[PDB]
């Protein structure tokens, strides 16, 4: 309701033929209960390419649920997310 | 086209905890769309952080605003910085 | 000398209440700093979070074994905030405690 909970899900794309470009295109071509906000993010650098999603939830349980719209990205990239983090929103 | 920067502190080396920073917070800029404080607890360790939403990559690379006070509260600069392009948002 | 520890817990997953919201209410409505109930040495509110699931609870230190098994005192407001009675009760003997 007022306290929000954040889940961050990240894929390192070093071990995948998918890139930020290819995944941006699949997003271009191709309302969940409890979910206030869903954001797709990316990063490029010497470290390598990364794809991810940031979820704002209105309940603590949902934050640990299987993240929505991840199954489709899993088969596109080739594997389970390399990183997953859990936060509380303290002030926005 | 928006950009997202996140600044984090591992709190294990500070007297500060998520709880004490939360309490302090409770009792107390060009290009910047949104500023959000975040925290993390559990077996992996305590963290405090700020998430910024920018509309330019320059401002995003600029030194994070409103971080000065927190650096004083924790006792050191952020231990981790990450930089993202926003691809899509609801 | 012999003390008895009763722990009552609420699983919060079925409730609109959360650790954050219970903690916020507590912050704006301070509980008694001292014990009122005869035989009650100490009362502590506790919480847990993370993948296991959210929980709220009360830990009681009693000087008699009868009270340890009675209805736990001072939980009426929390029961109203959560919307149900404790989902779990545990009974312990204190075998040794540091001072």
Author numbering:
A (entry chain C): 6 to 35, 42 to 103
B (entry chain B): 8 to 35, 43 to 104
C (entry chain A): 7 to 105
Paper text:
Thiopeptides are a class of sulfur-rich, highly modified peptide antibiotics that are active against various drug-resistant bacterial pathogens. In contrast, the amino group of the terminal amide moiety in nosiheptide is endogenous and derives from an extended Ser residue of the precursor peptide34. Dehydration of this residue at the early stage in the nosiheptide biosynthetic pathway generates enamide, and subsequent dealkylation requires the activity of NosA, which has recently been characterized as a new terminal amide synthase, leading to a Cα-N bond cleavage for nosiheptide maturation with release of the co-product pyruvate. In conclusion, we characterized three key elements (basic lysine, acidic glutamic acid and flexible C-terminal loop) for the terminal amide formation in nosiheptide-represented thiopeptide biosynthesis, these mechanistic studies on how NosA works present an intriguing paradigm about how NosA family members function during thiopeptide biosynthesis.
